């Protein structure tokens, strides 16, 4: 059954299906959110918390204000994440199809990726618009005679 | 049922299970090999052919002589590949656990990877021994203010 309740420091939102108005109004700086097994859902978290984690979600739409640490999108499909404020790092792991919408205050965000595909970082521009840039998913590795030297095969549309 | 027969230019070896002596003696420069759905199998291909493709194999052990073009290891788990002679590129895609054993004559081989994990390139050393090097599977991406700049997070044991 669909869950959405704070359990200690953890904001548990799981098993959501075809909902799109989910909102977590209250919030504490040391809290964390764990969005699990949610498909075709849309969630918004108001306030600055410690970290978020999208695990095993499909067609999930997330939008948050601030995160003190990390935002993880693991084992998912077609996830959309948006920062209104600031986020240090957004880590995409074992996820296929992910769009990270940054903001004027998180242009310094670091995008860690692994075993993932179809990732795009949307950059904000004066006028509520975003430019799309694909993050590389393929790499060419070579032997130096001393070590392995890896290059990134840049993606284009 | 287990298959292993030349069908045109294609050397079809599929559905093999718990075999380990498979060998393709004959060989033509324009042929290709397609190892499909083979688990806990060991195959050796003698001679120089155009290309090999390991698709959907588990615990597969392959060893070939020469390849004119590419060796693909796609959608697999725990695959071991070894070149006695020369191979231009070895591409690992959607594969978890792959060990590429190179040779004195293919040290210039290129290792293309994507959506894969646990990959290692074994480099030969005077004495029938190999040194192991893990190929990167995680990447850090940053916004330039002009473009995205991707760095490789180097793997260590």
UniProtKB/Swiss-Prot annotation, chains A, B:
It is found in: Cell membrane. Residues 1-135 form the C-CAP/cofactor C-like domain. There is a cross-link at residue 30 (Glycyl lysine isopeptide (Lys-Gly) (interchain with G-Cter in SUMO1)). Directly regulates filament dynamics and has been implicated in a number of complex developmental and morphological processes, including mRNA localization and the establishment of cell polarity. Belongs to the CAP family. Homodimer. Binds actin monomers. This is Adenylyl cyclase-associated protein 1. The lineage of its organism: Eukaryota, Metazoa, Chordata, Craniata, Vertebrata. The chain holds residues 319 to 475 of 475 of the full protein.
């Amino acid at each position: 059954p669909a869950v959405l309740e704070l359990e200690g420091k953890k904001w548990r939102v799981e098993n959501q299906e075809n909902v799109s108005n989910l909102v977590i109004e209250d919030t504490e700086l040391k809290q964390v959110a764990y969005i699990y097994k949610c498909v075709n859902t849309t969630l918004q978290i108001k306030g600055k918390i410690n970290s978020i984690t999208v695990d095993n979600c499909k067609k999930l739409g997330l939008v948050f204000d601030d995160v003190v640490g990390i935002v993880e999108i693991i084992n998912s499909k077609d996830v959309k994440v948006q920062v209104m404020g600031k986020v240090p790092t957004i880590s995409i792991n074992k996820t296929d199809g992910c769009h990270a919408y940054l903001s004027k205050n998180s242009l310094d965000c670091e995008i860690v990726s692994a075993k993932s595909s179809e990732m795009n970082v949307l950059i904000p521009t004066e006028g509520g618009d975003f430019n799309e840039f694909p993050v590389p998913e393929q790499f060419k590795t070579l032997w130096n005679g001393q070590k392995l030297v890896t290059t990134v095969t840049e993606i284009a549309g």
